[PDB]
Enzyme design. Structure first.
Site, mmCIF file in Angstrom:
data_model
loop_
_atom_site.group_PDB
_atom_site.id
_atom_site.type_symbol
_atom_site.label_atom_id
_atom_site.label_comp_id
_atom_site.label_asym_id
_atom_site.label_seq_id
_atom_site.Cartn_x
_atom_site.Cartn_y
_atom_site.Cartn_z
ATOM 1 N N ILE A 30 0.805 -1.251 0.000
ATOM 2 C CA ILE A 30 0.000 0.000 0.000
ATOM 3 C C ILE A 30 0.820 1.274 0.000
ATOM 4 O O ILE A 30 0.236 2.347 -0.244
ATOM 5 C CB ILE A 30 -1.036 0.037 1.143
ATOM 6 C CG1 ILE A 30 -0.384 -0.009 2.516
ATOM 7 C CG2 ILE A 30 -2.046 -1.077 0.940
ATOM 8 C CD1 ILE A 30 -1.270 0.260 3.742
ATOM 9 N N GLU A 32 5.136 3.219 0.178
ATOM 10 C CA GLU A 32 6.583 3.133 0.124
ATOM 11 C C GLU A 32 7.195 4.449 0.444
ATOM 12 O O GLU A 32 6.543 5.509 0.327
ATOM 13 C CB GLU A 32 7.086 2.653 -1.244
ATOM 14 C CG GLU A 32 6.729 3.603 -2.363
ATOM 15 C CD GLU A 32 7.342 3.189 -3.682
ATOM 16 O OE1 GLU A 32 7.372 1.983 -4.003
ATOM 17 O OE2 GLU A 32 7.756 4.076 -4.509
ATOM 18 N N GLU A 37 9.021 -0.168 2.953
ATOM 19 C CA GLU A 37 7.804 -0.659 2.335
ATOM 20 C C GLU A 37 6.707 -0.741 3.351
ATOM 21 O O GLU A 37 6.968 -0.996 4.524
ATOM 22 C CB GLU A 37 8.037 -2.081 1.752
ATOM 23 C CG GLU A 37 9.227 -2.167 0.795
ATOM 24 C CD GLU A 37 9.002 -1.456 -0.528
ATOM 25 O OE1 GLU A 37 7.815 -1.279 -0.946
ATOM 26 O OE2 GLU A 37 10.009 -1.124 -1.191
ATOM 27 N N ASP A 189 7.300 16.445 9.845
ATOM 28 C CA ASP A 189 7.246 15.904 8.461
ATOM 29 C C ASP A 189 5.817 15.561 8.099
ATOM 30 O O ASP A 189 5.544 14.505 7.536
ATOM 31 C CB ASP A 189 8.166 14.718 8.271
ATOM 32 C CG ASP A 189 8.488 14.455 6.795
ATOM 33 O OD1 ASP A 189 8.276 15.316 5.977
ATOM 34 O OD2 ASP A 189 8.851 13.300 6.530
ATOM 35 N N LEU A 190 4.887 16.503 8.363
ATOM 36 C CA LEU A 190 3.470 16.177 8.238
ATOM 37 C C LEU A 190 2.939 16.537 6.855
ATOM 38 O O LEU A 190 1.993 17.302 6.682
ATOM 39 C CB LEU A 190 2.690 16.821 9.398
ATOM 40 C CG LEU A 190 1.315 16.278 9.675
ATOM 41 C CD1 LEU A 190 1.010 14.861 9.515
ATOM 42 C CD2 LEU A 190 0.844 16.738 11.044
ATOM 43 N N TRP A 192 1.181 15.568 3.166
ATOM 44 C CA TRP A 192 -0.188 15.001 3.031
ATOM 45 C C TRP A 192 -0.196 13.508 2.713
ATOM 46 O O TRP A 192 -1.249 12.918 2.748
ATOM 47 C CB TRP A 192 -1.019 15.762 2.014
ATOM 48 C CG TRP A 192 -0.502 15.805 0.550
ATOM 49 C CD1 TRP A 192 0.770 15.546 0.051
ATOM 50 C CD2 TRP A 192 -1.272 16.249 -0.565
ATOM 51 N NE1 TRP A 192 0.784 15.748 -1.318
ATOM 52 C CE2 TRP A 192 -0.454 16.210 -1.695
ATOM 53 C CE3 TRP A 192 -2.604 16.632 -0.706
ATOM 54 C CZ2 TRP A 192 -0.924 16.566 -2.947
ATOM 55 C CZ3 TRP A 192 -3.052 17.008 -1.937
ATOM 56 C CH2 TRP A 192 -2.228 16.948 -3.042
ATOM 57 N N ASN A 194 1.044 11.702 5.030
ATOM 58 C CA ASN A 194 1.087 11.255 6.444
ATOM 59 C C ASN A 194 -0.160 11.604 7.216
ATOM 60 O O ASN A 194 -0.173 11.497 8.442
ATOM 61 C CB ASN A 194 2.331 11.890 7.072
ATOM 62 C CG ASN A 194 3.584 11.208 6.625
ATOM 63 O OD1 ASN A 194 3.516 10.082 6.118
ATOM 64 N ND2 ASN A 194 4.720 11.835 6.777
#
Ligand SMILES: Nc1ncnc2c1c(Br)cn2[C@@H]1O[C@H](CO)[C@@H](O)[C@H]1O
Ligand SMILES: [Br-]
Ligand SMILES: [Co+2]
Ligand code: NA
Length: 338
Positions: A30, A32, A37, A189-190, A192, A194
């Site tokens: 789903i 990477e 992975e 590190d937000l 999109w 995440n």
């Protein structure tokens, strides 16, 4: 001991410990990144997401050196601490992904996972190397998470209206505020990728901030924040973080406001990543609001004055939010959330 003392096994385990045959047979890839992975699978009738990261070896993987165990520990610790917020009392949120288990695994990559990897490569295309080159002494960290739904980037054309965007921003802001209050957390590190979205039948979602409980209308979605590879927090003055002070490449991206956020964080903190600067959470929230207004496209536009009003309120948030000092300040003081 495995899984932070909550598994009875000591020393690395085989992949089969984490991925028994039926679980491994049901794996579909789903996601990477350079890190490795992400697979989805099912056990006890419940989807989960499995993040697999090679560590400790000398091979480049996806063009980058592997992390050492010491370098991967922050992500593991932060995943656990944020998951635990779902069960706390004074500072409680379900807005970070649940962590089911963490294992250190030894072995070559399972052929059934290579099958899944190939299927993704054939259908979506991969920027990674086919992970078929690992020897039987290779170490990996396997993190098993709650399945959080689909990322906001993949939902670019899929959401109903900007009313949904309001709920999403509120949920994000609340989760980050609770983590600020409990853990002096910065996500850092937000992007999109995440922000995950999944359907809920709950009409409203509950959080508690410094002992005060509140609710957020869901619009039928529950938001989960993922990916703590750059994150920072602390407990009792012990700071857990990713020191990126000597990283070059992180600050030289182009083509997306995302890349400016790394530079803007570095400006805010004077390149001292151990310090607490919860303004970085505001910066990421501004980047997400910007995505909502500029790149997301909704099935239903703001056709009525009441919808044009919500649009106006989100535009107002976008132009004012950078004058707030933290997600906590935003949640508690911004008019959008009253
Ligand atoms: N817990 C999860 N539930 C669902 N999807 C997940 C995850 C973690 C990653 N992912 C996808 O893997 C990607 C890379 O990280 C993300 O952008 C997501 O699409
Ligand atoms: Br993740
Ligand atoms: Co175990
Ligand atoms: Na969640």
């Amino acid at each position: 001991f495995q899984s932070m003392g909550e598994c009875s096994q000591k020393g690395p385990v085989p992949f089969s410990h984490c991925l028994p045959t039926e679980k491994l047979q049901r794996c579909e890839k789903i996601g990477e990144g350079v890190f490795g992975e992400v697979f989805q699978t099912i056990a006890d009738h419940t989807p989960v997401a499995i993040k697999i990261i090679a560590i400790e070896g000398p091979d480049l993987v996806n063009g980058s050196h592997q992390k050492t165990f010491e370098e991967i520990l922050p992500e593991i610790i932060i995943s656990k601490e944020l998951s635990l917020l779902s069960g706390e009392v004074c500072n409680r949120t379900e807005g970070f992904i649940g962590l089911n288990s963490v294992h250190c695994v030894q072995g070559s990559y399972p052929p059934l996972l290579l099958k899944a990897w190939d299927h993704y490569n054939s259908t979506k295309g991969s920027a990674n190397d086919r992970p078929d080159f690992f020897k039987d002494d290779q170490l990996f960290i396997v993190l098993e998470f709650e399945f959080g739904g689909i990322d906001l980037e993949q939902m670019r054309t899929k959401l109903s209206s900007l009313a949904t965007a309001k709920s999403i921003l509120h949920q994000l802001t609340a989760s980050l505020a609770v983590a600020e209050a409990s853990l002096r957390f910065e996500h850092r590190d937000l992007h999109w990728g995440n922000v995950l979205l999944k359907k809920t039948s709950l009409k409203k979602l509950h959080y508690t901030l410094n002992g005060k409980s509140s609710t957020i209308p869901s619009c039928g979605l529950q938001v989960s924040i993922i990916d703590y590879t750059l994150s920072r927090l602390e407990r009792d003055g012990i700071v857990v973080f990713c020191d990126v002070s000597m990283d070059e490449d992180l600050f030289t991206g182009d083509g997306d406001y995302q890349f400016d956020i790394y530079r803007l964080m570095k400006k805010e903190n004077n390149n001292r990543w151990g310090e607490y600067h919860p303004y970085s959470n505001v910066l990421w929230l501004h980047y997400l609001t910007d995505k909502m207004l500029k790149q997301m496209t909704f099935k239903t536009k703001c056709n009525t004055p009441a919808m044009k009003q919500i649009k106006r309120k989100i535009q107002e948030f976008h132009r004012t939010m950078l004058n707030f000092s933290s997600a906590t300040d935003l949640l508690c003081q911004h008019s959008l959330f009253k």
